[PDB]
Write a protein that binds this ligand. Structure first.
Ligand code: HEM
Ligand SMILES: O=C1N[C@@H](Cc2c[nH]c3ccccc23)C(=O)N2CCC[C@@H]12
Ligand SMILES: O=C1N[C@@H](Cc2c[nH]c3ccccc23)C(=O)N2CCC[C@@H]12
Ligand SMILES: [Mg+2]
Length: 396
């Protein structure tokens, strides 16, 4: 019956999420608009915990070529595996993510990240007119994050190529299927040519750490490095840029909350966590394949079927959060789902929280920052997996 996704490309969540959440069944059938595949959809917090903590519902099997899927094309250059995390597991490197992405990486990078956030915001505060927080703040900050922490030194042309491929490939619609496949082919061909060199540029970026990691087999090949490059782009680039843009819109809409953060900087970490709950990001869902015949809260799922969890729907579940549609940094609720749950909890969470915190603090230190247009005049890219406005006109 209901086709998926729900076309809610702005920060207004589709009403279909609450409608399914309040239905009797804890899992609801939908149909992929792009493929016609039947899919299951979970929208309730309690059910999502149980599903995402169950290793019998496999992420790798839902990523694999040939799986039923919500996305209109396979997210891979044809003929490639295109599962960088599985590649790291086969290589024995799952721990290298911790070194390049965990608290050790945050210690290494937090200083320059905050220096850059303040440098960008201070320059905007010096301008005699308006500016665009998306292009003038989020783009340089997120580009620096990807280069310095993930890929290595990138030229502006290389950064633009990778950003184009991410925006073209990671879509439910708005491009033809052939252009979407070509975006992944373009990015894979870029990394086949350049991943080795990038891994050798100065810095402690994750791609270097992967290339230099001790492996029981040989040190990783150029093909393995290329798989890692595409993973890091799709997981790190449009997510960070979309989230930072959305978080800025949330802050600009809540001046009373920003004033409290200005007066009490020790409350910023709680506001970061509330932004991760409140600010929607993906227009799709995390998903898992049943590896055998299973039951989730009484509903039978056959082996090979795919079950989706909308993190936005879970983060807005009123059985978990009181007044879920209110931005409330003081909130004393359960853990949010903005980074997922269980064994697949975002390994980028530490670096993401550091860049989000640096952005929140840069805003909170300078009262009066506001939208320069009406909030309904904000224009959205339509069809991206990871929501992003076309521009955020702003001023003091
Ligand atoms: C605000 C920014 C970000 C958000 C909201 C976010 C969110 C998430 C979420 C919800 C998942 C779970 C997907 C699932 O359960 O299938 C995930 C996984 C992942 N994230 Fe992040 N992420 C962000 C930034 C980053 C960054 C900067 C990196 C750097 C490489 C990264 C790397 C990854 C990887 C590799 C995975 C896959 C983990 C797995 O499948 O086991 N993320 N992210
Ligand atoms: O490591 C993975 N995990 C899941 C979730 C995901 C996390 N970040 C993503 C970015 C875009 C699409 C999906 C995801 C996935 O679907 N994957 C294919 C591309 C990255 C790979
Ligand atoms: O929109 C998507 N979201 C991720 C999961 C995710 C949900 N929220 C996230 C936030 C950050 C990274 C990944 C996710 C995913 O698996 N996808 C397969 C095709 C569509 C694509
Ligand atoms: Mg199949």
């Amino acid at each position: 019956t209901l086709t998926y996704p729900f076309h809610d490309w702005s920060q207004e969540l589709s009403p279909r999420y609450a409608q399914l959440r309040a239905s009797d069944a804890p899992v609801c059938p939908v149909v992929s608009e792009g493929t016609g595949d039947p899919l299951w959809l979970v929208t309730r917090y309690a059910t999502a915990v149980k599903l995402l903590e169950d290793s019998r519902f496999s992420s790798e099997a839902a990523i694999a070529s040939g799986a039923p899927r919500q996305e209109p094309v396979e997210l891979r250059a044809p003929g490639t595996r295109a599962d960088g995390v599985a590649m790291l597991r086969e290589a024995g490197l799952r721990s290298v993510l911790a070194d390049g992405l965990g608290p050790r990486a945050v210690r290494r990078h937090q200083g320059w990240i905050n220096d850059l956030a303040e440098t960008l915001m201070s320059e905007l505060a010096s301008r005699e007119g308006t500016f665009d927080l998306a292009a003038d703040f989020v783009e340089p900050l997120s580009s620096a994050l990807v280069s310095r922490t993930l890929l290595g030194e990138l030229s502006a042309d290389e950064r633009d190529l990778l950003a184009h491929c991410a925006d073209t490939g990671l879509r439910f619609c708005g491009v033809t299927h052939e252009e979407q496949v070509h975006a992944f082919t373009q990015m894979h061909e870029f990394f086949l040519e350049h991943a080795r060199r990038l891994a050798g540029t100065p810095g402690e970026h994750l791609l270097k750490l992967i290339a230099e990691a001790p492996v029981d087999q040989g040190p990783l090949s150029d093909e393995a490095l290329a798989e890692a490059g595409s993973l890091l782009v799709v997981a790190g680039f449009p997510t960070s840029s979309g989230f930072l843009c959305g978080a800025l819109l949330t802050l600009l809409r809540h001046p009373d909350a920003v004033q409290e953060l200005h007066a009490h900087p020790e409350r910023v970490p709680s506001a970061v966590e509330e932004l991760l709950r409140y600010t929607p990001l993906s227009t799709g869902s995390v998903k898992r394949m049943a590896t055998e015949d299973l039951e989730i809260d009484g509903v039978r799922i056959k082996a090979g079927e795919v079950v989706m969890v909308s993190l936005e729907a879970v983060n807005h579940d009123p059985d978990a959060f009181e007044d879920p549609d209110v931005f409330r940094p003081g909130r004393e609720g359960p853990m949010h789902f903005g980074f997922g749950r269980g064994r697949h909890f975002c390994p980028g969470n530490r670096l993401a929280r550091c860049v989000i915190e640096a952005t929140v603090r840069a805003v909170a230190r300078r009262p009066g920052l506001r939208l320069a247009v009406a909030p309904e005049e904000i224009s959205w890219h339509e069809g991206l997996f990871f929501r992003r406005p076309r521009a955020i006109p702003a001023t003091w």
